[PDB]
RNA sequence: AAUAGAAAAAAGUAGGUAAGGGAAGUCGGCAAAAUAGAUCCGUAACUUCGGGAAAAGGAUUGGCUCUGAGGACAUUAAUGU
RNA sequence: GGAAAAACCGUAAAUCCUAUCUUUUAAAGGAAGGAGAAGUCGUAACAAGGUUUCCGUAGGUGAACCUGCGGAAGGAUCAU
RNA sequence: AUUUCAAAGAAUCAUUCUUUUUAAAAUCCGAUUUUGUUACUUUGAGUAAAUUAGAGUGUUCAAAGCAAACAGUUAAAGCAUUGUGUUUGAAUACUAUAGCAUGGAAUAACAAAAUUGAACAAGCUAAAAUUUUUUGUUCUUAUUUUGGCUUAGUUACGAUU
RNA sequence: AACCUGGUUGAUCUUGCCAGUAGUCAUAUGCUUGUCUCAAAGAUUAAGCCAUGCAAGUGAAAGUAUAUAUAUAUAUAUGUAGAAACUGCGAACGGCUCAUUAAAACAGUUAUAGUCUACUUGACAUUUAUAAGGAUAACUACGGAAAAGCUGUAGCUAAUACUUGCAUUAUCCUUUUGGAUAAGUAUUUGUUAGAAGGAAUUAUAACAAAGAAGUAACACGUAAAGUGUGUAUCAAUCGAGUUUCUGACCUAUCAGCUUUUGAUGUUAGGGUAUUGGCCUAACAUGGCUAUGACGGGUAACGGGGAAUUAGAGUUCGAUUCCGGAGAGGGAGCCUGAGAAAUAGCUACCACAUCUAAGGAAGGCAGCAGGCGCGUAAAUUACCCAAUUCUAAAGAAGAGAGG
């Protein structure tokens, strides 16, 4: 496909002089999509052919920003308990998230992220599955058991 | 200088309390230029010794149709991907676009096949030019404020094309 | 600045120590090496506070400068190296052997060990690495290289060791149905045979063990040493051999002495 | 241009310039000096909310050698003039 | 190989000019609030308190207050 | 509001706790064993001591403490075949409200959701594999099998009040 | 221990407060004190100031002694001690205070496949030799300065100080023999192959190039053959840095904040011990905000916990442990594995001491003790016997500690 970066695409790993793309199983029970397998897509923070490492905990969460370059925003919606009153508040909290160039997400999709290796100042994580899912109502209202 | 004092993730300006500590550093940057080579040994923590290179001249450079190596004279610093200060002073790094002499490698190829290991495709087009003006153009693999050394590989194929048609015409 | 702590006080000291509230303000930290420090009893508590073969650390420090004494049947030359989860000493003038393992009490013992099974130990090993020139490494629990160890052999299983040529003798592979031994769980310092070893992705991993008694408890598979077979244990386990008593069970037998 | 020349002091008139202090001057800072162009920042009391405002108060500005941004035409996205 | 000395970036204390914010704290005069003594002046409210009361509101008034306008009874009428 | 009610036995004091079995789909040798997610709950794992609850233990009692106890005028005894004290004790639990594993039939949530969807049989077809096949860097063609895709039929076929 | 009385009135029931009443390992104080056990004790107020003294050194098989002493045999032979000094290692701990800090620090819980790691422990190495190269201290002498932990010459001389430098294994042919061929640990690049982990661009194996550093020119001594000290790489270990999730007191008379000065992203580099806007350039225009962001307050170090608890709770947590912070104010380095150290150093400001008037040196929130502050708080005591720590680690030190 078209080029219009200033950097050549490198996709470390994928060697040259061997007859004739590099990916990896990525594990617990969870495995490449079909546009990991076959796609042309070059990137370093891409989980599949990248060098991150999809190391701690994996969580889920609803996209509420995806409007960065290969980037989302996931807010993660719980429940807090008080103590005193022995009863509940509604709480919750943001994790700003890599998109991967596989998925195409979008506004209140479920995501399912993982820890990885931290990229840069505010983002530390990446999604290993977009989960489809519709809510018609905005997303900074929206409250889901994620 | 390295760590906290820099703005809050809610872009709050937060007070800072826990003086510096050794561990925490803001050194120089790797200012390496074309001349008779100069390193200067630099001593990190644990005594983990690393070398700024100053000045170089003869790194090790790869030619990537035989996969084979050798130590060569770069002839000039050529062109930068980011940066036009790194280019026009002449200081390389390891994103940095040299020239480098083709004797080595026309050497090389000359032992194998008899005119100018084992069977291939061999020559390409792009490489047989800078070939035949006896200078080629390369790119820097190693990181010489870290290591002392601007080893690299002949720049090949479309990574060649893209970069030259850049270059240029224009200019 | 913000460097080592070398000291440790009293309360600071692990539970089983037994260095009480009166009689001082410090305990000793254990020199590096062979077992890690919270996992570890050195031979000051041993000889003194076990044993009681010493009145003070002055006197422990009386015995260490004298040569009798010798852990994994060679000298040692303070009063701080580190006794570990399990290992050898001899006391030579005595002629007196101890292997040490850990109480249904939780605490550590000197078990009395005679000399023919005193050439060898049982030993867990912790890793397996790969070398350069394609040769294996083991990696023990008491802190070892065994290099050329035998392939088939994998990272839970335990090896019978010679003390002196230090060469392998056997090794008991991890199975269903081997006799284990707890090192520091809430179910620590006790044996069993094994229910199940359950294996999880990317997580810590589950062993069910069943009791002499017949009854079942659950334990982290990482603090698991195995020490049998079903035929038996390997080495000598203490006179009590692990067993559970209750509570209640036990104030019934305190009160009938 | 209702004149020229020579000499060059007072004094005059139109101008300049002046150490150190800085309105102690006088009717009154009169006179004179200081400020001043652009570009970038920053801008209060108060206010009929429009203003105040170029407020106040700052910074920058030469010469050279480079880099980037901003057109027009014609060959099926790239390449040309 | 090599000391002093200089120069350049990069850290960067401190000093000074402002700018904003914080804290007490001064100030003639203005204008308040409470405490004390059987002080001066009315007689306002309490009963239909001798003009029903109270609300909202505006204007007057040395005041306590009065008057207008529209409400309510917490009215002195819950009754052709 | 709404969606799987129950039945019979055995144990046991008229009572109580428990076990067996009653549709469908997938799998293994006509029999055998599996089947949404989360909240909630159960057990657990791993978890500083001091403190705290709390056991053992007459510090002269108690506050305390973590010690002690036994017999011997120096042996009875145990065990080594004249040598050698012994029993010991220094427990257990609380140890976020979260994370981790874990049994769960109720209760809550959520999930797909006929302005049309998916379960099967049939025929065509391109992807991968199987079987075939000469010549000691390496080379033609062919049957077949498995998954994907287009099209007529066939299910108790497919929407709670 | 799951608990109440007196007070509106002429008298009453109600609302409602006030008052009593009890506790406080919570402070002060008045009076009184025959005992004994037990023992908190200059936080609140000034992270204000300090007189004098003391608080970290280290040599018993194992670096260096023609200062010297000494035991045998006889100014000689052996030897054995040794003031002293170079060298080595420690002083990064422990002690002190709680000023600053309000999503940071702290607590549990991850992750470090993004890393470093002295002592200690176990594995265990690759491209002139009966012993090499000098140069330096103490030391000898002349000196200099009022003072000071000031130091100048010249001649020396050592070191385990400093600097050089001396096969063999595996592949192919041949019988547990004889020939031929190769041979760099980290570290880095380019090219492939690919025992383990849930996941590998990992272990590992090969190729082509570079490439540190190295592998003992050292000391004791096991029948009435042993050991120390040193050494590259690897692992372990004592640890440490980062890093995930979850958790805050009061305040809206604090509602929009952040973004030219990196705010948020992407790319490329540099820097780092390593990830990282950590730092530079280029390119995007984001990001955070009533679940109270952003400010402001706090007599706010955090926790384990403490007080009162019938059950909830409420108040409190300088203050024996763990973790953090700080060492007059700020700031910066050096040394070393470890320090942005503080009885390390440098500088500025705030203080301040001796001066010979040139100059020079100083830092109690270590232990006493003093001043000032105050409502408020102890001795310049004695000791290392125990508890432990540091060293050339027994035998010595330690106002740690008792």
């Known amino acids: 496909d078209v080029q219009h970066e200033r950097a050549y695409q490198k996709q470390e790993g994928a060697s040259f002089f061997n007859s004739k793309r590099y990916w990896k199983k990525v594990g617990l029970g969870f495995a490449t999509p079909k546009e990991a397998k076959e796609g042309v897509y070059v990137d370093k923070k891409c989980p599949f052919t990248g060098n991150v490492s999809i190391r701690g905990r994996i969580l889920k969460g609803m996209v509420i920003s995806n409007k960065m370059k290969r980037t989302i925003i996931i807010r ?20 700003p998230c890599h998109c991967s160039p596989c998925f195409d997400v979008k506004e209140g999709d479920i995501v399912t992220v993982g820890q990885c290796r931290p990229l840069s100042k505010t983002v530390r994580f990446n999604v290993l599955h977009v989960e489809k899912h519709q809510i018609f109502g905005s997303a900074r209202k929206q409250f889901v058991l994620f | 200088r390295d760590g906290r004092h820099k703005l809050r993730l809610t872009g709050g300006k937060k007070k800072i309390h826990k003086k510096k500590r050794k561990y925490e550093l803001g050194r120089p940057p790797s200012n390496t230029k074309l001349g008779s080579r100069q390193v200067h040994v630099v001593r990190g923590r644990g005594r983990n010794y690393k070398y700024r290179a100053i000045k170089l001249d003869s790194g090790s450079f790869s030619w990537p149709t035989f996969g084979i190596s050798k130590n060569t004279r770069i002839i000039d610093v050529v062109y930068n991907a980011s940066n036009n200060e790194l280019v026009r002073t002449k200081t390389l790094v390891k994103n940095c676009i040299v020239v480098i002499d083709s004797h080595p490698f026309t050497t090389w190829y000359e032992n194998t096949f008899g005119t100018t290991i084992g069977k291939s495709k061999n020559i390409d087009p792009l490489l047989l030019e800078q070939f035949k003006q006896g200078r080629v153009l390369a790119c820097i693999s190693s990181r010489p404020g870290q290591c002392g050394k601007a080893d690299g590989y002949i720049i090949e194929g479309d990574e060649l094309l893209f970069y030259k048609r850049k270059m240029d015409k224009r200019n | 600045g913000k460097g080592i702590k070398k000291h440790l006080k009293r309360v600071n000291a692990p539970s089983h120590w037994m260095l009480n509230k009166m009689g001082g303000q410090y305990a000793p930290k254990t020199s590096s090496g062979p077992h890690k420090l919270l996992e570890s009893i050195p031979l000051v508590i041993l000889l003194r506070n076990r044993l009681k073969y010493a009145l003070t650390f002055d006197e422990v ?25 399990m290992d050898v000493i001899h006391i030579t003038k005595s002629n007196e052997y101890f292997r040490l393992l850990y109480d249904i009490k939780g605490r550590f013992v000197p078990h009395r060990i005679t000399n023919e099974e005193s050439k060898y130990k049982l030993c867990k090993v912790k890793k397996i690495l790969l070398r350069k020139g394609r040769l294996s490494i083991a990696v023990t629990h008491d802190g070892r290289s065994i290099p050329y160890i035998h392939p088939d052999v994998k990272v839970n299983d335990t090896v019978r060791l010679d003390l002196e040529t230090g060469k392998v003798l056997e090794h008991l592979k991890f199975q269903v149905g081997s006799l284990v031994m707890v090192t520091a769980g809430h179910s620590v310092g006790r044996v069993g045979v094994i229910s199940s070893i359950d294996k999880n992705m990317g997580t810590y991993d589950i062993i069910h063990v069943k009791d002499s008694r017949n009854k079942v408890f659950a334990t982290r598979l990482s603090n698991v040493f195995v020490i049998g077979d079903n035929t038996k244990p390997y080495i000598s386990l203490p006179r009590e051999k692990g067993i559970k008593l209750d509570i209640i069970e036990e104030r019934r037998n305190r009160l009938k002495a």
């Open chain 1, 76 to 95: 993660r919606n719980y429940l807090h308990y008080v103590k005193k009153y022995n009863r509940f508040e509604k709480r919750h909290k943001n994790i």
């Open chain 3, 61 to 85: 420090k009386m015995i260490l400068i004298q040569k009798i004494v010798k852990v994994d049947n060679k000298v040692r030359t303070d009063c701080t190296f580190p006794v570990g989860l």
